Structures are given as structure tokens and as C-alpha cells.
């Protein structure tokens, strides 16, 4: 203020900005065959848990 004589004037205020884009669309999609569900040695539920773990 002292170097500017003793003068002042109002500057315009402003913003900065960033955009959070909700732009990631990811999917899991698979078949459990009715024949294989009978013919395998045990449960196949583990593929649903593995699909959820991949996402």
C-alpha cells in the first residue's frame, strides 16, 4: 500500500476447479452350465466370490 503511493483498487475474485468424472463402468459376466454343476466334484459358488473379488 505504501509503494502504491497510498492508493488501492478492488481486484476481481476468481475460482479454480477440478471435475470428478463418474466415468468408470466395470462388469463381470459368466455362465455356470447346468450339466457342469451336476458333473463336477463339488460346489461352484466360489466363482461368484471370485467375481466379486475381481471387481
Amino acid at each position: 500500500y505504501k509503494a502504491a503511493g497510498r492508493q488501492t483498487s478492488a481486484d476481481a475474485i476468481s475460482d479454480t476447479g477440478v471435475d470428478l468424472l463418474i466415468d468408470q463402468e466395470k462388469s463381470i459376466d459368466f455362465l455356470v452350465d447346468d450339466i457342469d454343476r451336476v458333473q463336477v466334484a463339488g460346489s461352484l459358488e466360489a466363482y461368484t466370490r471370485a467375481g466379486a473379488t475381481a471387481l
Partner: protein
């Protein structure tokens, strides 16, 4: 000037002072206005020596 008070008239109509803030600096601004007028209502009742003086 030799005269009688009743030979001339004066009106002060506005006599005001205000404070403001300066737009260009951190200051008060003090301003005052005076609005007024006057007339010699009877010219023979005012007698002037050296009226052309200065």
C-alpha cells in the same frame, strides 16, 4: 462602506458537512456545501468610498 442593516439582505439556504470513505485510498473524505445569496434592497442606504478600489 457606510450602511444600515435593513438596506441589504443575505440568505444562507444550505450549510451542511458530511463524512464519506474515499474510493481510491483508506481515507475519510470530508466535504461541505454552502448555498447562499444576497441583495442590496435599498441602494441609497449603502454609501461607498472608493468603490472602484482594486
Amino acid at each position: 462602506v457606510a450602511f444600515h442593516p435593513s438596506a441589504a439582505a443575505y440568505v444562507s439556504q444550505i450549510d451542511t458537512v458530511e463524512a464519506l470513505r474515499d474510493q481510491d485510498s483508506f481515507s475519510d473524505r470530508i466535504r461541505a456545501l454552502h448555498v447562499y445569496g444576497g441583495k442590496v434592497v435599498r441602494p441609497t442606504g449603502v454609501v461607498v468610498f472608493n468603490k472602484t478600489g482594486s
